[PDB]
């Protein structure tokens, strides 16, 4: 409503998708990626490090709680798990963050490829 107006669309681009995904943090450092397959450990029930359901780079699970632990209550608004990558809010921010497999090889997109038109 008002805030939005009209939707352009173009070929996306790494270096451009390199503008979102990564979220440098005042650990002073640089967070975006993922690297290693994962859901949570079995025994505990929460993602891991990288981890496809990350509780750090991705955010919370139990709402306002650093994977480092020692994190309860909420009101904080910048927390960065001192010693972990937990930056809590509501467990909502988690839904609004992406990462990337970072293809070692320059793979091409099937959506041009055998594409009915096959633009490429």
């Amino acid at each position: 409503t008002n805030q939005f107006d009209y939707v352009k669309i173009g070929l996306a681009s790494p270096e451009r998708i390199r503008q979102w995904g990564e979220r440098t943090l005042p650990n002073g450092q640089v967070v975006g990626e993922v690297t290693k397959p994962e859901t949570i450990n079995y025994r505990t029930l929460k993602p891991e490090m990288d981890g496809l359901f990350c509780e750090r780079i991705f955010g919370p699970a139990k709402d306002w709680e650093c994977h480092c632990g020692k994190y309860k209550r909420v009101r904080h608004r910048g927390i960065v798990c001192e010693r972990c990558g937990v930056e809590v809010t509501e467990s909502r921010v988690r839904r609004h963050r992406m990462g990337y497999i970072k293809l070692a090889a320059p793979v091409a997109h099937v959506w041009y490829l055998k594409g009915i038109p096959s633009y490429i």
Partner: peptide, 10 residues
């Protein structure tokens, strides 16, 4: 890569 909570694990 899509966020996790939405492809989620059930």
């Amino acid at each position: 890569v899509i966020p996790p909570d939405l492809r989620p694990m059930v």
